[PDB]
Amino acid sequence: MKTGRIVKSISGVYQVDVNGERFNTKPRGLFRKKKFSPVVGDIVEFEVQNINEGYIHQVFERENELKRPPVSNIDTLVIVMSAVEPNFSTQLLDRFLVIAHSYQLNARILVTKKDKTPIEKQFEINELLKIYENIGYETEFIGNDDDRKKIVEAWPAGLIVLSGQSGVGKSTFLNHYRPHVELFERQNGYIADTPGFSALDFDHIDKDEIKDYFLELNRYGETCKFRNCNHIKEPNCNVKHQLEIGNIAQFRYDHYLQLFNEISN
Amino acid sequence: RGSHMKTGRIVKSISGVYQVDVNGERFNTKPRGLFRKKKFSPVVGDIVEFEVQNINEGYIHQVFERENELKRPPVSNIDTLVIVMSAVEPNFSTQLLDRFLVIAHSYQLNARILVTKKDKTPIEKQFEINELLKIYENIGYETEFIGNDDDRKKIVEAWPAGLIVLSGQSGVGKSTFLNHYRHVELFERQNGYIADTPGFSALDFDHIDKDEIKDYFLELNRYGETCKFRNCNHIKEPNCNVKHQLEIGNIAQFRYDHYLQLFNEISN
Ligand SMILES: [Zn+2]
Ligand SMILES: [Zn+2]
């Protein structure tokens, strides 16, 4: 028996990587079901046959997954934002982070097009990224002067998936590895060759979960007077309080309220 | 207005006054003479009978025989020792966990296993760890694997009734469980109490003989019953059921390996 990640799917043959060695595996004889469809990202236990073939015994229960593209067990969603063309937007970035955590994904932030960004504007984005760093995210600000392969190689261990709108430069990263979805090797893991549905979407989300996905509202929410305080019109609200003494950025709370209202309608 | 003689647990010990919890009510008790005359040696966790004096104080009558204890810190009558290990920072070690379980059972403590930092752990490593925890489960331990997402107060509340002591080394996430509650003190929870402790160490080559080690590998204990050899240490003895169960996969190699290393280490 061997364990590894499915990196490639084609006509019901699943290619599992085990310590850099590829095995062309299939489902064992019995399996056809609603719970019988492996995806790229799946961790499987398989029995070796014919040197580099095998028969999948179990698919481990997925920690997470996306439907478009179909990919499971994502270790880090990199949210890719351009500094210009279009302008860096905390409204958009806050939306993306919320959707990331709605799918249970760890996220980090990558800003592109530094070399096309006026330095005064660069310094504005820097102070904004420090508020995201306060909240708990890793942030990077790059342009054409930075080695993209080494950026990708240095990201945390495991499966990287890139997410972000068209034209932010995701393919500039994905073409150091590439030329449906396939995983490619990094020194300490993998990267998917297809972005996470680009401008990512929420799937099902209720108005009461949004505060969970603002990680600082989540934290500061723990002592709000009301049990399930939405931090909107509740008295004795510690989010309102931490906002008032400046440990929550106003744009974060503004975006929270906008999204809360959007989801209710 | 209540009864005269009461039984409960010492939750706090400060300068010769022993605070005793009787059904959620605290009584500050001591021996009924000069503190000098050293009559009782009570420890946090002790079950004691006292006579009620001046409303919410008392005279200790009797400390019941300890079912178990630690000397460091000094705490008796532990219902569950929770061994807290990180998945990462530092890396999960079946070597260290096996050692901790041996110390635990050497003090006749029931143990369970808590792994932290799931959220900092690459998913492929998480599944490796889930696969190792299933082996400890087959051996008969309760196991949990948590990160930041999980509700601590809730987990710490859902553990078996009575006194929980968390044990594990520096920087593993233990402080985080206790902050929903706050030498040593017990804090009330629904269904019992909880306390802290800084992990084990010089407790192996402290009171354990080479011949006891196999008692505290719970599956070696159980399989050892039908070894032909008297006092079988499962090393080179023939007609060894441990060696046999191992050969057919009922004992994990890493368990037998850790047993062998520890045995050789205590032969010094
Ligand atoms: Zn609130
Ligand atoms: Zn034996």
Residue numbers in the entry:
A (entry chain A): 1 to 179, 201 to 286
B (entry chain B): -3 to 178, 201 to 286
Reproduce passages from the article.
One class of assembly cofactors are the ribosome-associated GTPases (RA-GTPases), a subset of P-loop GTPases within the TRAnslation FACtor associated (TRAFAC) family, of which the proteins RsgA, RbgA, Era, and HflX are members. RsgA is a nonessential, highly conserved late-stage 30S assembly cofactor that has been implicated in the docking of helix 44 (h44) of the 16S rRNA into the correct conformation and therefore correct maturation of the decoding center prior to subunit joining. The overall structure of RsgA consists of three domains: the N-terminal OB-fold, the central GTPase domain, and a C-terminal ZNF. Both the OB-fold and the ZNF domains are involved in nucleotide recognition and target RsgA to the 30S ribosomal subunit, where they contact major helices of the 16S rRNA.
To look more at the mechanism of (p)ppGpp-mediated inhibition of RA-GTPases associating with ribosomal subunits, we solved the structures of RsgA in both the apo- and ppGpp-bound states by X-ray crystallography in order to compare to already-available GMPPNP- and GDP-bound structures. The 1.94-Å structure of RsgA complexed with ppGpp reveals the presence of the nucleotide unambiguously represented in the electron density map, whereas the apo structure at 2.01 Å lacks any electron density in the nucleotide binding pocket. In our structures there is no electron density corresponding to the Mg2+ and the switch I/G2 loop is unresolved, likely due to innate flexibility when not contacting a γ-phosphate. Compared to our apo - and ppGpp -bound structures, the switch II/G3 region appears highly similar to that of the GDP-bound structure, leading us to conclude that the OFF conformation is maintained whether in the apo state or when bound to either GDP or ppGpp and that the switch I/G2 loop would remain disordered in the absence of GTP. The biochemical studies carried out here indicate that ppGpp-bound RsgA most likely mimics the GDP-bound OFF state, an assertion that we corroborate by solving the crystal structure of RsgA in the apo- and ppGpp-bound states.
